[PDB]
Coordinates of C-alpha atoms and ligand atoms in Angstrom, one line a residue:
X19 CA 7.4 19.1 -22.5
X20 CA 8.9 16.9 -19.5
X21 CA 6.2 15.4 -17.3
X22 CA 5.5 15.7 -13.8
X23 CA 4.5 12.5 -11.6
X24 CA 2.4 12.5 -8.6
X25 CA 2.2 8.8 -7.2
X26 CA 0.3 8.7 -4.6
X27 CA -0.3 5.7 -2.4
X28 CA -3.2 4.6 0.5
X29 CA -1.9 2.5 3.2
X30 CA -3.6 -0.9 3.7
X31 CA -6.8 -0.1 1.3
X32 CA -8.5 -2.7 -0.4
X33 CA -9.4 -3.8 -3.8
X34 CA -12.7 -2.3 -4.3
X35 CA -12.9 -0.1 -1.7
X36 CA -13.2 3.0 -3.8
X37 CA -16.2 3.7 -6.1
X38 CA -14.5 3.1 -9.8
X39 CA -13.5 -0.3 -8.4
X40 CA -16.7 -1.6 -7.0
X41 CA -17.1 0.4 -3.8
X42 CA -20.1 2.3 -1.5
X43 CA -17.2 4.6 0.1
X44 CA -17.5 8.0 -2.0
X45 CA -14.1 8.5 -3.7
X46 CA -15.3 11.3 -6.4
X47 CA -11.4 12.7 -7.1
X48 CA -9.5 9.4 -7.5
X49 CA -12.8 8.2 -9.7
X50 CA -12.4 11.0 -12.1
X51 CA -8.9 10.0 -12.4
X52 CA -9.9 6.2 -12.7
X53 CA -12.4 6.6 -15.1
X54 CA -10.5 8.8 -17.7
X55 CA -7.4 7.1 -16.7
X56 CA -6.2 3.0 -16.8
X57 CA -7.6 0.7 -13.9
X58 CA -5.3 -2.2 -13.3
X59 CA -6.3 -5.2 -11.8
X60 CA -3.3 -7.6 -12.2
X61 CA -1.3 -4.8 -10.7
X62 CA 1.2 -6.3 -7.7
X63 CA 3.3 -4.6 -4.9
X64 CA 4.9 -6.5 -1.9
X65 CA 2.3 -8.3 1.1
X66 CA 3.6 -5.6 3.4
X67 CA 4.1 -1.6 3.8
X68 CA 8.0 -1.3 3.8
X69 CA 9.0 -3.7 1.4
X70 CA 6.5 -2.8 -1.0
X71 CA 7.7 1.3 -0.7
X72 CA 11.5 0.1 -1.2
X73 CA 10.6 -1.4 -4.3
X74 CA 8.5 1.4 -5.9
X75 CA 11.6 4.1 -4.9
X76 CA 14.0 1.7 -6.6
X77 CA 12.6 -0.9 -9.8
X78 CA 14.0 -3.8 -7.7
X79 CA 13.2 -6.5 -4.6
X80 CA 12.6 -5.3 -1.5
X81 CA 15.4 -8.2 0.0
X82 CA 17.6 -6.0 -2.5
X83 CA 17.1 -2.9 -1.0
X84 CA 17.2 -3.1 1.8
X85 CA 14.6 -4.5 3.9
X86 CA 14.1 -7.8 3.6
X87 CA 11.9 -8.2 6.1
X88 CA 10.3 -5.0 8.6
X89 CA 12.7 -3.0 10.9
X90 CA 10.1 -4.3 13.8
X91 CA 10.3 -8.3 13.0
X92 CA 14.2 -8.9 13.8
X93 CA 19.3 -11.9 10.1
X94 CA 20.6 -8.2 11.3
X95 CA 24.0 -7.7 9.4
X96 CA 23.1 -9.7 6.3
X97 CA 22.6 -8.1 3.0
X98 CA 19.6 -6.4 2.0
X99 CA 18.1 -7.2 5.9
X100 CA 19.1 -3.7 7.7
X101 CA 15.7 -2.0 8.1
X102 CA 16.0 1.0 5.7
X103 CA 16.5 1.4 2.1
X104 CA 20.5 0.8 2.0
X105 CA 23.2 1.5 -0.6
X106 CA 23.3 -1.2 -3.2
X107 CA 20.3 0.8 -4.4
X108 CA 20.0 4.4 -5.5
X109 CA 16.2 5.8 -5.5
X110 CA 13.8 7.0 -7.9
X111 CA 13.8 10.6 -6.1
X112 CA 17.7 10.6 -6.3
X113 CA 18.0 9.9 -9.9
X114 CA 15.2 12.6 -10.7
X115 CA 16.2 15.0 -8.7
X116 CA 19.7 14.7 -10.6
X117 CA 18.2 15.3 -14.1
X118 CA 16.4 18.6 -12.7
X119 CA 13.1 17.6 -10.9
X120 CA 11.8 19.1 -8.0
X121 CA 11.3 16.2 -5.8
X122 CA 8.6 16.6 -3.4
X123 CA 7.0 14.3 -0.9
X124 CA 4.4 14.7 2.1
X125 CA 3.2 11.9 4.0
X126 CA 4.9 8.0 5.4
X127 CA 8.1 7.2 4.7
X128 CA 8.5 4.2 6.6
X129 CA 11.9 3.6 4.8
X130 CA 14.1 4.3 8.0
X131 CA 13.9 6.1 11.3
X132 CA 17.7 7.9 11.3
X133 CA 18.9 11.3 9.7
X134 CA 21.4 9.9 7.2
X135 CA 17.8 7.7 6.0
X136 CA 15.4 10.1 5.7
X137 CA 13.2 11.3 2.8
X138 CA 15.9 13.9 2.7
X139 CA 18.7 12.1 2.8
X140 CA 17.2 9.8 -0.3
X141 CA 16.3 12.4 -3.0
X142 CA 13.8 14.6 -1.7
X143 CA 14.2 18.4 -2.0
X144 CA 11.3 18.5 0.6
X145 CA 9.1 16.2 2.8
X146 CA 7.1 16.3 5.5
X147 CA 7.0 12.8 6.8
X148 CA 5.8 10.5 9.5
X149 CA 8.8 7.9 9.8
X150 CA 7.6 5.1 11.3
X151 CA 4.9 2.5 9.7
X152 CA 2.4 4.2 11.6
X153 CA 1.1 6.1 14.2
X154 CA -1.9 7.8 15.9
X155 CA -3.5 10.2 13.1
X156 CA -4.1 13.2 15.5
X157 CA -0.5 13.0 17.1
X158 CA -2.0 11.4 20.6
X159 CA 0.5 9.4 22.2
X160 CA -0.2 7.4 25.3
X161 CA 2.7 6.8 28.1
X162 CA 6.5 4.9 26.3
X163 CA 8.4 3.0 29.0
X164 CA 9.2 -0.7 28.8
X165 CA 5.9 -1.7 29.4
X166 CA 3.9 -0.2 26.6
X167 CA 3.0 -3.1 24.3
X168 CA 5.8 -3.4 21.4
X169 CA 3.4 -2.0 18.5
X170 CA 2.6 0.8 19.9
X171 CA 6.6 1.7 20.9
X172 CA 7.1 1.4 17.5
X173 CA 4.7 3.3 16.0
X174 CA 5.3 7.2 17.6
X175 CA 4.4 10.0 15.6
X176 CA 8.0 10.7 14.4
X177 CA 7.8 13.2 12.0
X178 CA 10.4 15.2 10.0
X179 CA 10.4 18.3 8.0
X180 CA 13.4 17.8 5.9
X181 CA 16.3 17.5 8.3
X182 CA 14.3 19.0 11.3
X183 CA 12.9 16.5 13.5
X184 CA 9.7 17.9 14.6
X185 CA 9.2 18.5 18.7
X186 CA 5.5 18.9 18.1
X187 CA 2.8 19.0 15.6
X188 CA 0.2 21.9 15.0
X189 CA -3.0 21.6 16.6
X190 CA -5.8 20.0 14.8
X191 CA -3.0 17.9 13.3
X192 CA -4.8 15.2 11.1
X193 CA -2.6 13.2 9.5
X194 CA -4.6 13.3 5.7
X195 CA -4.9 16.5 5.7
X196 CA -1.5 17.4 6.6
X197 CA -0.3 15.6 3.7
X198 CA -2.7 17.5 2.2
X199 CA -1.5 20.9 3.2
X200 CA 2.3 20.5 3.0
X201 CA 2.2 18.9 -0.5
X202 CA -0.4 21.4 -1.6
X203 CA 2.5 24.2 0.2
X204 CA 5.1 23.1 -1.8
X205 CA 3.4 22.8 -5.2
X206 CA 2.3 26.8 -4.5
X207 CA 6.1 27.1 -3.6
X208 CA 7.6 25.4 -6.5
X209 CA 9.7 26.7 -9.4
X210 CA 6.8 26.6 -11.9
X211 CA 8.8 26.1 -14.8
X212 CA 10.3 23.0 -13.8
X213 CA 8.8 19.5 -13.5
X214 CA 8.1 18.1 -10.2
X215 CA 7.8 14.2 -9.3
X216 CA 5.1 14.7 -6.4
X217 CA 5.1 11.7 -3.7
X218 CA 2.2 11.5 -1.5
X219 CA 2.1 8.2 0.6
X220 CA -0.9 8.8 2.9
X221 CA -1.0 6.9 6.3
X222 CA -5.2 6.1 6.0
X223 CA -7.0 3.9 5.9
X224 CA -4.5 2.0 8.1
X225 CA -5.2 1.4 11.8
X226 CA -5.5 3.1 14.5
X227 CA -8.9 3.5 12.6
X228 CA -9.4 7.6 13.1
X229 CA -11.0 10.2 11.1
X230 CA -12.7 13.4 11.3
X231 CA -16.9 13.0 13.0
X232 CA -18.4 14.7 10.5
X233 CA -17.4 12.3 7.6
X234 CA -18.0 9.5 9.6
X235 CA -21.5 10.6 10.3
X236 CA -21.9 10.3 6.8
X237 CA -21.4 6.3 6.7
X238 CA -24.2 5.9 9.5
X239 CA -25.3 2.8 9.5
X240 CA -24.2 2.1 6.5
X241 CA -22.4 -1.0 7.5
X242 CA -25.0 -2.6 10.0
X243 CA -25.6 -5.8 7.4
X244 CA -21.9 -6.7 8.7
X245 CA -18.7 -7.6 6.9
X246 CA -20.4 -10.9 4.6
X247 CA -23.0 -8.6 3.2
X248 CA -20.8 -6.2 2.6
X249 CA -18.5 -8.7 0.4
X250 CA -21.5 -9.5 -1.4
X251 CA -22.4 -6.0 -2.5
X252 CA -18.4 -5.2 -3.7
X253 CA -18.8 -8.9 -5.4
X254 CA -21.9 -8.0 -7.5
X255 CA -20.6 -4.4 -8.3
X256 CA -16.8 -5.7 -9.0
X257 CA -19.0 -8.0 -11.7
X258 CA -20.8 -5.2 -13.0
X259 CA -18.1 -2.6 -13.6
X260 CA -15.7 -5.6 -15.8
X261 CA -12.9 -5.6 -12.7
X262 CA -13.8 -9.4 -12.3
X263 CA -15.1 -11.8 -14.6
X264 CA -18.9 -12.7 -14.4
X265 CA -17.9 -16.0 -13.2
X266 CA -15.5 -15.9 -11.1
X267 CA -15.4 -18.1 -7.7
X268 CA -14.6 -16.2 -4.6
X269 CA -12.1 -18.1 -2.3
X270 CA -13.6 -18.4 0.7
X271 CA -13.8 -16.1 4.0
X272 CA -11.5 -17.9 6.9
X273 CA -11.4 -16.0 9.8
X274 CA -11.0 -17.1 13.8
X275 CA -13.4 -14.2 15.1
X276 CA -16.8 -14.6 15.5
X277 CA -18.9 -14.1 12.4
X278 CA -21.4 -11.2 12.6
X279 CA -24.6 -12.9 13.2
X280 CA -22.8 -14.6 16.2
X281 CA -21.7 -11.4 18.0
X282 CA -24.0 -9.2 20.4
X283 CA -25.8 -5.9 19.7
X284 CA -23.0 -4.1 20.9
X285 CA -20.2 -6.3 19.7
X286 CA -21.7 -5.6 15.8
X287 CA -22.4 -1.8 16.5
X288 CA -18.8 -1.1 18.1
X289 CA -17.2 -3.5 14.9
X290 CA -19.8 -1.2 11.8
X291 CA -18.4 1.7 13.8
X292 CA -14.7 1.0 12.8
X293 CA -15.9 0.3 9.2
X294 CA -18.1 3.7 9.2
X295 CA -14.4 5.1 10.2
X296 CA -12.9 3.4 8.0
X297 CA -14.5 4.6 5.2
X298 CA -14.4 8.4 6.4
X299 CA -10.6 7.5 6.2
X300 CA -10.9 6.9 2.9
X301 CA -13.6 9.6 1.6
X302 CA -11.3 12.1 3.7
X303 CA -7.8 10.7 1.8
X304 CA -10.0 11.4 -1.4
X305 CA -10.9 14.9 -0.2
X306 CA -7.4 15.8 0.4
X307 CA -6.5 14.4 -3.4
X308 CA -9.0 16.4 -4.7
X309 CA -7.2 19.4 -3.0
X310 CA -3.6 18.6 -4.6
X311 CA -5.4 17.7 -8.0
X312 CA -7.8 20.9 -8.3
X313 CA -4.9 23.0 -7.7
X314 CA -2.3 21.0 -10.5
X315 CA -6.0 21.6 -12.7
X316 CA -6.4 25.3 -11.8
X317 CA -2.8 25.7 -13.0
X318 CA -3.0 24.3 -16.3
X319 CA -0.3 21.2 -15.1
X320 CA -3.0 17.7 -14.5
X321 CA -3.0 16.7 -18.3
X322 CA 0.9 16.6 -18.1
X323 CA 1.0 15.2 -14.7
X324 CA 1.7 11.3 -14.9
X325 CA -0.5 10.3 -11.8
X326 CA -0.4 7.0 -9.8
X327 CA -2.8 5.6 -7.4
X328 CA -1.9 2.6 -5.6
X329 CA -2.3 1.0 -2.3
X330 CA 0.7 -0.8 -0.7
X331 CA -0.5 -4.0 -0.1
X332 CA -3.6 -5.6 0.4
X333 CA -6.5 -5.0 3.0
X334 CA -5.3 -5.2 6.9
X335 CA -7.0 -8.1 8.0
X336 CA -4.3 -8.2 11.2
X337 CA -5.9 -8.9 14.4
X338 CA -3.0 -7.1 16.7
X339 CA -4.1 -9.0 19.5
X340 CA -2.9 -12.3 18.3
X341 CA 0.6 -12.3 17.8
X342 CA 2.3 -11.5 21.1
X343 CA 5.4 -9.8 19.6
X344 CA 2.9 -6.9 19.1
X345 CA 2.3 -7.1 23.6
X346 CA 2.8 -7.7 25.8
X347 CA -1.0 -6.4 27.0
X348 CA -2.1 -5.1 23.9
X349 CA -5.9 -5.2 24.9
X350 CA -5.4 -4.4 28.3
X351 CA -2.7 -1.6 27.5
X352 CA -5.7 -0.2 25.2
X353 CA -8.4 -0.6 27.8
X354 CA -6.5 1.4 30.5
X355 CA -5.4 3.8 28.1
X356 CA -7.9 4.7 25.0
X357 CA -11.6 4.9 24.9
X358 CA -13.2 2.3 22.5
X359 CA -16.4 3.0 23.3
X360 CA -18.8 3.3 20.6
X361 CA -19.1 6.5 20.8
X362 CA -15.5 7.7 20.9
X363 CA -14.0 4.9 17.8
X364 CA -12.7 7.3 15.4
X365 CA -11.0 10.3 17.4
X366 CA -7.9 10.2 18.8
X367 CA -8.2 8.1 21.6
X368 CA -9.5 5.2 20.9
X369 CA -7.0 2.9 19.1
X370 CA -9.5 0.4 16.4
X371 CA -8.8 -1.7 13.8
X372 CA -11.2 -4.0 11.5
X373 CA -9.9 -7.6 11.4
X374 CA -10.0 -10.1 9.0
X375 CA -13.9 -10.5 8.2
X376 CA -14.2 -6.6 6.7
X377 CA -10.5 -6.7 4.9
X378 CA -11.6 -10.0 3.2
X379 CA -14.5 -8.0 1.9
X380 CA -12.6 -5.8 -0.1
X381 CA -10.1 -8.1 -1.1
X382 CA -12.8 -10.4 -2.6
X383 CA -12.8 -12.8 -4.7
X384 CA -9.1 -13.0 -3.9
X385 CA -7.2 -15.2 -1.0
X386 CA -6.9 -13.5 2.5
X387 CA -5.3 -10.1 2.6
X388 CA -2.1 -8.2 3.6
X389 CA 0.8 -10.2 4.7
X390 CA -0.2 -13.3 2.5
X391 CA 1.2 -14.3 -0.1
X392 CA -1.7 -14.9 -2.1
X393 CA -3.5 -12.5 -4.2
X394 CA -5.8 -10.8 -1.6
X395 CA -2.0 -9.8 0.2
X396 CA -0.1 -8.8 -3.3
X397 CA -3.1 -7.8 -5.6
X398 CA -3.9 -4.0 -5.2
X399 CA -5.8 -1.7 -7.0
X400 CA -4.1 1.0 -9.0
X401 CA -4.9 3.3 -11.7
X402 CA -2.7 5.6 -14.1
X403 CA -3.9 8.8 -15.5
X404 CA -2.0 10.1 -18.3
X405 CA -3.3 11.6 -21.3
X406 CA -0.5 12.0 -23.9
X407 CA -0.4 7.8 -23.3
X408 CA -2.8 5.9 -25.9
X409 CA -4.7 3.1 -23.2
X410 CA -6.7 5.6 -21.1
X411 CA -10.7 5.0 -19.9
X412 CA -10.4 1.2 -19.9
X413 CA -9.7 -1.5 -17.6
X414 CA -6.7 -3.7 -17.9
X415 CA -5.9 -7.3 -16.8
X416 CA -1.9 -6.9 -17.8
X417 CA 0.1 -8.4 -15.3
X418 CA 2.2 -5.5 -13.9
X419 CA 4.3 -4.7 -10.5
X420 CA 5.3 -1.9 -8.0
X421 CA 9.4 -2.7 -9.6
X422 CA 7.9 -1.9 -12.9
X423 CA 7.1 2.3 -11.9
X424 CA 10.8 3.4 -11.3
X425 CA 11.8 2.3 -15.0
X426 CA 8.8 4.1 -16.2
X427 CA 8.8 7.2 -14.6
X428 CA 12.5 7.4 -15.6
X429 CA 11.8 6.4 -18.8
X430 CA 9.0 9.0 -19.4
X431 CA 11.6 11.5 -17.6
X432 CA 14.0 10.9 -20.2
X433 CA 17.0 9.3 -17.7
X434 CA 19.0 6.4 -18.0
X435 CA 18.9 4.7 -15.2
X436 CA 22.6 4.7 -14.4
X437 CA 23.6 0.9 -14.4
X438 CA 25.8 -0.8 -12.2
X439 CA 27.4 1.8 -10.5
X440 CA 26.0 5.0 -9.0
X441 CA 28.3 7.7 -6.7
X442 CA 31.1 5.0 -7.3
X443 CA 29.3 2.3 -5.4
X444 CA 28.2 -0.6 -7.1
X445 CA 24.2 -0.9 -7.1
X446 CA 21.2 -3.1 -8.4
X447 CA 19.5 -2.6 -11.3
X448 CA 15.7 -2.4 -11.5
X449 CA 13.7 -5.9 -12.0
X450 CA 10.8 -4.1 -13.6
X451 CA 10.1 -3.4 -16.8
X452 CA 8.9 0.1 -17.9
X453 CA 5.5 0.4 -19.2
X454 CA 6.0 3.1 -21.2
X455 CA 5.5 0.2 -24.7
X456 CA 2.5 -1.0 -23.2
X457 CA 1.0 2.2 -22.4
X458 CA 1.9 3.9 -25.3
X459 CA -0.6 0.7 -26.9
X460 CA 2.6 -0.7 -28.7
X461 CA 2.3 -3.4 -26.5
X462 CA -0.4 -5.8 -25.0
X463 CA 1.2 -5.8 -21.9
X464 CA 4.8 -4.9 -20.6
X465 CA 5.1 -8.5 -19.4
X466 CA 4.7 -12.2 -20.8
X467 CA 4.3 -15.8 -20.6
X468 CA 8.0 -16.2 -19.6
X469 CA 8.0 -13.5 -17.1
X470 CA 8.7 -14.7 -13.8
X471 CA 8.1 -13.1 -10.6
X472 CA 9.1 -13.5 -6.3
X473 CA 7.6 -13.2 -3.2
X474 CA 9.2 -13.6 -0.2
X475 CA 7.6 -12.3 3.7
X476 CA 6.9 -13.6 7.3
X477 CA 8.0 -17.2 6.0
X478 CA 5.6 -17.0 3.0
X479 CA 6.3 -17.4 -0.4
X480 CA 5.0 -16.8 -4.3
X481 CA 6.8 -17.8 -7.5
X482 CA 4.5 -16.5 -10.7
X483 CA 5.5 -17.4 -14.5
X484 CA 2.9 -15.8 -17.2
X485 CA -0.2 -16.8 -14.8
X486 CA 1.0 -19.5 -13.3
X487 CA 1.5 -18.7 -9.8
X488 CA 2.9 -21.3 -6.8
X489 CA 2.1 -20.6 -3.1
X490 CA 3.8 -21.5 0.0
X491 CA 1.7 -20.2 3.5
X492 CA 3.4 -22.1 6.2
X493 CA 1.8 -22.5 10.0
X494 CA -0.7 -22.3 11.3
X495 CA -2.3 -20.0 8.4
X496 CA -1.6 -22.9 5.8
X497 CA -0.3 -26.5 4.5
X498 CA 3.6 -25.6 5.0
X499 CA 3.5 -27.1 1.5
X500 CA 3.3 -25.4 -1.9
X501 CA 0.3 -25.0 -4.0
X502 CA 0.0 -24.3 -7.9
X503 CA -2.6 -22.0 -9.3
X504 CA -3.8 -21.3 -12.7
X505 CA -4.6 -17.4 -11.9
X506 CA -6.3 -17.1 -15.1
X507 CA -8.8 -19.9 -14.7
X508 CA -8.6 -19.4 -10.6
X509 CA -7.8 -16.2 -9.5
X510 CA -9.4 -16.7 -6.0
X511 CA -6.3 -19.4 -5.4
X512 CA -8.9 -21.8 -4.6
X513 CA -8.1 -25.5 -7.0
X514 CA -4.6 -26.8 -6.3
X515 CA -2.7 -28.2 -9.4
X516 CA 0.1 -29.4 -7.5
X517 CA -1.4 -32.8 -8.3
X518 CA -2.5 -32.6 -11.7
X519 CA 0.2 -30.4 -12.8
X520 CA 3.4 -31.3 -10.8
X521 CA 5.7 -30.5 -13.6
X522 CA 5.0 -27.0 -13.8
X523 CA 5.2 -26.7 -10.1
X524 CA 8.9 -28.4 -10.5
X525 CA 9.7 -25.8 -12.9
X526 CA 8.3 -22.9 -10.7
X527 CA 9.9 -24.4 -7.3
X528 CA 13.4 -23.8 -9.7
X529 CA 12.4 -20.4 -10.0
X530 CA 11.7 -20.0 -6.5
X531 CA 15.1 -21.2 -6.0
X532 CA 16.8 -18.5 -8.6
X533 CA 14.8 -15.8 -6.9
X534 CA 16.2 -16.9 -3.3
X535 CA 19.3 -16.5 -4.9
X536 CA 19.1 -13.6 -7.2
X537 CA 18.0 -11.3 -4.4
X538 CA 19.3 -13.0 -1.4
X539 CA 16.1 -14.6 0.7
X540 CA 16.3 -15.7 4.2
Ligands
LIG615 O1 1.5 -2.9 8.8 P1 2.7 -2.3 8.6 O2 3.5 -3.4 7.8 O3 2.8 -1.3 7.7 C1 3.5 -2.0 10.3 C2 3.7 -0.8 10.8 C3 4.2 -0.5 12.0 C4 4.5 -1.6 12.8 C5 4.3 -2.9 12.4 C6 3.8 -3.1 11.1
LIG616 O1 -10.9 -5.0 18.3 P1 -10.8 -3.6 18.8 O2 -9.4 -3.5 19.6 O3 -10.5 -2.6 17.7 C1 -12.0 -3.2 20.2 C2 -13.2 -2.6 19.9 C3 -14.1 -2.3 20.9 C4 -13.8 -2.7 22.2 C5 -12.6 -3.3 22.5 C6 -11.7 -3.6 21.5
LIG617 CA1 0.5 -0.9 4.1

């Protein structure tokens, strides 16, 4: 008995947005799994989409494999910097799909736009995928000339069905639940009596914030108190369930909008609209897991299914209108083009997303949120639900990382990974350390003291050792200086011990300097 794996991944969710990790939004098929399974909340992936989903298909850095920093932000012709996952890496999917897996994927790719770079050509038997980092959730696409603001040209729904590029989508096309359907189509379709490695990268909660009426009707005003309350409440509950300690001191919110109790009546009921969305996102991304986990249950396979939940990065706390690369005209593009009334925010066209006051909510008590460096950027919730392993229905504070699932997965599969040299060309090998000792309860963790760790985004960057953890967050978001944390006194990356503690900063700044090196930073 081989296991199966079903890793499935939210887009841009945060910490304790779902129940079993301190949340209000109702998340009933991924809390089952949480509950039974092993919560993680040391857990680490890249501060961004891409890079994080090249290093979960390989075991190694995302300036490794290939995109060093997003397709849309460029460097073009060095190595590791083309845009796609590239060739001095083979994938998880390939190497699986070798030693006899069906390898089966619906939902973002976001790993590469052309045909030689699709799910297809990278290991998957089938996939239906959007290929871009996102798009509009009900296929809706407003006018592309030269004009339309950057973001939005690069966000089209481009979707493939294995090597067919799609020239429409079905009607009542909603992103979720076609990821639903398609994987749920080809686990019916399968060859039952072999394993499958299941990949279902959803595209919610992430903006344009979109999601059926009827779910969002459930959150009705369930978000009026406004962003700060809201923190509060996932605060208190994140201390109640053990995912924090009792203790702990919450970095504090920085934000250049408008806090809640300055905006107007509408202002506040248009922004709790987005969040009542937002949370349907989620609930409905849990609905559509239920589906693909009922029917694994109905068929006898869940107990030796392997199954991942993680989100990609931390919670988007973006606001698009700020950084003109996204333009030109974002806001006015939008205006003459989408309907953000407050009626309309969650169908097709309007065209919403949070900001930084509701994303810092559920990335409490850590530092800011996705593209950061800091923890509220790189911490994300994940759990693992595996029976025949020995830590299951407890939470764990083992320092782990999105590199570390490839050599486990391949691990439990029973395949080498191949080395230096796959097809003849010479590749990496994986950075992460399978958990399959730790797990197993061999182990305390599958990581140690001496275990040191890179970031590298946007011009920010993290060195970790053990818990030590240095920050660099240049202009106009921070010092442009590095910063020392003690992560398991601080873990909101609040007391700088660059001061008090300048020799261990020395000795992380080295590291910094082999991890530029080792994986070839810009
Ligand atoms: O927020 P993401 O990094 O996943 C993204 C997607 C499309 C365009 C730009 C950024
Ligand atoms: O900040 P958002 O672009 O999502 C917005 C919401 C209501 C009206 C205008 C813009
Ligand atoms: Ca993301």
């Amino acid at each position: 008995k081989r296991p199966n794996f079903l890793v499935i991944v939210a887009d841009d969710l945060g910490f304790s947005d779902i129940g079993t990790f301190g949340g209000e939004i109702a998340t009933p098929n991924l809390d089952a799994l949480a509950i039974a399974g092993l919560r993680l909340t040391d857990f680490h992936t890249a501060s961004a989409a891409s890079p994080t989903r090249s290093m979960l298909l390989t075991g190694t850095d995302h300036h490794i494999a290939g995109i060093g920093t997003m397709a849309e932000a460029l460097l073009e012709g060095k190595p590791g910097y083309e845009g796609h996952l590239n060739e001095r890496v083979v994938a998880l999917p390939e190497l699986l799909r070798e030693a006899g897996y069906q390898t089966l994927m619906a939902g973002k790719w976001h790993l590469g736009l052309k045909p030689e770079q699709t799910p297809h050509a990278r290991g998957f038997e089938r996939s239906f995928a959007l290929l871009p980092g996102a798009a509009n959730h009900y296929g809706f696409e407003p006018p592309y000339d030269e004009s339309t603001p950057r973001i939005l040209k690069g966000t089209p729904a481009l979707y493939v069905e294995d090597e067919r590029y799609l020239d429409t989508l079905p009607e009542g096309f909603y992103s979720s639940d076609a990821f639903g359907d398609k994987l749920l189509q080809y686990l019916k379709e399968r060859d039952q009596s072999r394993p499958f490695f299941a990949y279902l990268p959803f595209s919610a909660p992430h903006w344009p914030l979109q999601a059926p009426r009827e779910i969002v009707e459930k959150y009705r005003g369930r978000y009026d108190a406004g962003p700060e309350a809201l923190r509060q409440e996932r605060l208190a509950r994140l201390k109640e369930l053990g995912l924090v300690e009792a203790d702990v001191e919450a970095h504090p919110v920085l934000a250049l909008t408008r806090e809640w109790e300055a905006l107007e009546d509408e202002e506040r009921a248009k922004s709790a609209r987005a969040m009542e969305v937002y949370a349907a996102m989620v609930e409905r991304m849990d609905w559509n897991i239920g589906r693909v986990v009922d029917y694994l249950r109905r068929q006898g396979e869940l107990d030796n299914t392997f199954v991942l939940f993680m989100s990609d990065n931390g919670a988007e706390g973006a606001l698009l209108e700020a950084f003109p690369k996204f333009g030109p005209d974002l806001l006015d593009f939008l205006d003459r083009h989408y309907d953000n009334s407050l009626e309309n925010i969650g169908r097709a066209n309007s065209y919403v997303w949070y900001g930084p006051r509701w994303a810092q909510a559920a990335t409490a008590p850590s530092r800011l949120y996705k593209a950061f460096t800091t923890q509220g950027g790189i911490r994300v919730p994940a759990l693992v639900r595996y029976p025949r392993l020995s830590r299951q229905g407890a939470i764990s504070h083992a320092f782990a990382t999105v590199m570390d699932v490839t050599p486990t997965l391949l691990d439990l599969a029973g395949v080498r990974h191949p080395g230096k040299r796959w097809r003849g060309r010479e590749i990496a090998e994986p950075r992460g350390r399978s958990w399959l000792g730790w797990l197993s309860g061999e182990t305390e963790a599958a990581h140690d003291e001496n275990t040191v760790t890179g970031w590298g985004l946007f011009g920010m960057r993290a060195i970790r050792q053990g818990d030590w953890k240095a920050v660099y967050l240049p202009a106009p978001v921070g010092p442009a200086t590095w910063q020392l944390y003690d992560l398991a006194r601080d873990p909101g990356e609040i007391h700088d011990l660059a001061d008090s503690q300048p020799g261990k900063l020395a000795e992380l700044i080295e590291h910094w300097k082999r991890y530029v090196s080792d994986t070839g930073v810009v």
